[PDB]
Ligand binder design. Structure first.
Ligand SMILES: *[C@@H]1[C@@H](O)[C@H](CO)[C@@H](O[C@H]2O[C@H](CO)[C@@H](O)[C@H](O)[C@H]2O)[C@H](O)[C@H]1O
Ligand SMILES: *[C@@H]1O[C@H](CO)[C@@H](O)[C@H](O)[C@H]1NC(C)=O
Ligand SMILES: [Ca+2]
Length: 476
């Protein structure tokens, strides 16, 4: 599926090892500190697609599928998929080629997309750089395919970031020499054939900043689908230029101020407001970026705060911001693990309840986004507009005039006071009825064009015209 096809999607990102077992157990042990395979499978995912689609997601992002190093290293198993050795075999832990094709097919029967995580930068190996038997790598079965062994120490030296190895002396990540035509050609043939064999709709490309930029256009073109890159840097002047060589990047620029704004009742709404406007103006296309606050590479949101109002606001932001929302499996069950491995919790141990506070919130926010998109072909290309901020509030507007979603978010938290915010700049006409689609109350635009937004409980407010909800299942 094309970048234009992907703008309307909403992604549930999961670890294949951690989301769902074939046996469907909600009690099978998964000690994150052990760093071992817990037994999640592609078939497990298929069996729980009602759970995912019930939140209004249109797509899943699964961790990498290639065969990995076999060892239980000092840092555990390759359960995450980022330590590949044989790119023409699948990780048998997750099932067979038929199981991966059945997951793609199951998603397509429900009108959903499959996005697969891929790594071009490196292989994995149990042991120090000097101990590497390059013959285990398929097809790159020679040192001649790799950059000489060295570690990245000077992160300001982009040449060293690209040419030296990730990992350490315990688990090394041998660095492919992506400047070699033979390596480019092998990767380009591989990615096009992966996409073809498994009917993959889009890719999340790992580790993008660690491969020189000239590699990426050929890789994105060979894939033949929308590619979103992991460029792990919060500076939009570093990260957004990657969108000149790849369709999208993960929105790490928004990540840091989004987390800071909502993780505390003292968070900066100014930094978030400012970064929305910087990305809007200075990134090649904010509507092809992926918005997130939680992943397997940072502490979960609820590790910073267990306040559920704060968690609802940040989830609403992720859904309603420019670009593709991305929610990480467990976020909807308020998982609070810290850094790796604590943030790789098994989703099945929640019992997959569809009545949890954040399952309901995410379902409500996805519902109005999916509905608005279905009625407004301009929604996904209207650049999100922050219209208001104060110490505890940010309001933003997105969508075609007359059909815009106006979202008011708060960091007051669950013991927030009750008050009326008089909101200017929403663009609705006087006397217009609006539905607040999270709590299903109505607000009327005043004679002056200001919206009297009832604030309470630190709750997020998501406004849409009542007249435009005719025939929808929203708020009845
Ligand atoms: C992107 C990817 O570049 C990362 C490096 O492989 C990956 O981290 C994985 O490998 C490291 C280093 O061996 C482990 O400590 C992590 O547990 C594992 O996930 C990122 O997760 C991936 O997003
Ligand atoms: C896809 O299947 C084709 C035809 O059997 C094979 O040549 C190719 O290596 C496979 N690609 C992947 C990535 O498995
Ligand atoms: Ca590299």
């Amino acid at each position: 599926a094309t970048p234009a096809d992907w703008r309307s999607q909403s992604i549930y990102f999961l670890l294949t090892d951690r989301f769902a077992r074939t046996d469907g157990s909600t009690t099978a042990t998964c000690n994150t500190a052990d760093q071992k395979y817990c037994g999640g499978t592609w078939q497990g995912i298929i069996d729980k697609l009602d759970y995912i689609q019930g939140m209004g997601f249109t797509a899943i992002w699964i961790t990498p599928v290639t065969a990995q190093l076999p060892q239980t290293t000092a840092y555990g198993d390759a359960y995450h998929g980022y330590w590949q050795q044989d790119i023409y075999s699948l990780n048998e832990n997750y099932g067979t080629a038929d199981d991966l094709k059945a997951l793609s097919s199951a998603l397509h029967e429900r009108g959903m997309y499959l996005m697969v995580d891929v790594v071009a930068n490196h292989m994995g190996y149990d042991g120090a750089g000097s101990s590497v038997d390059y013959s285990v790598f398929k097809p790159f079965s020679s040192q001649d395919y790799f950059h000489p062994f060295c570690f990245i120490q000077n992160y300001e030296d982009q040449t060293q970031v690209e040419d030296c190895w990730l990992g350490d002396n315990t688990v090394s990540l041998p660095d492919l020499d992506t400047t070699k035509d033979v390596v480019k050609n092998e990767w380009y043939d591989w990615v096009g054939s992966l996409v073809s064999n498994y009917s993959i709709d889009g890719l999340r490309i790992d580790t993008v900043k660690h491969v020189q930029k000239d590699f990426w256009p050929g890789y994105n073109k060979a894939a033949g689908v929308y590619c979103i890159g992991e460029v792990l840097d919060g500076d939009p002047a570093y990260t957004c230029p990657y969108q000149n060589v790849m369709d999208g990047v993960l929105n790490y620029p928004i990540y840091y101020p989004l987390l800071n704004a909502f993780k505390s009742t003292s968070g900066s709404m100014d930094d978030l407001y400012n970064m929305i406007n910087t990305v809007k103006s200075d990134c090649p296309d904010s509507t092809l970026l992926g918005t997130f606050v939680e992943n397997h590479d940072n502490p979960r949101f609820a590790s910073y705060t267990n306040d559920i109002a704060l968690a609802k606001n940040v989830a609403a932001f992720i859904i309603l911001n420019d670009g593709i929302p991305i929610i990480y499996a467990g976020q909807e069950q308020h998982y609070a693990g810290g850094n790796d491995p604590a943030n790789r919790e098994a989703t099945w141990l929640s019992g997959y309840p569809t009545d949890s506070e954040l399952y309901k919130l995410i379902a409500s926010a996805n519902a109005i986004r999916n509905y608005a998109i279905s009625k407004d072909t301009g929604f996904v290309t209207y650049k999100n507009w922050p219209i208001y901020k104060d110490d505890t509030t940010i309001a933003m507007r997105k969508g075609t005039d007359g059909s815009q979603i106006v979202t008011i978010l708060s960091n007051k938290g669950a013991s927030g006071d009750s008050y009326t915010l008089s909101l200017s700049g929403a663009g609705y006409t006087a006397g217009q009825q609006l539905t607040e689609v999270i709590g299903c109350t109505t607000v009327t635009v005043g004679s002056d064009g200001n919206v009297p937004v009832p604030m309470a409980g630190g709750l997020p407010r998501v406004l849409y015209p009542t007249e435009k909800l005719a025939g929808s299942k929203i708020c009845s």
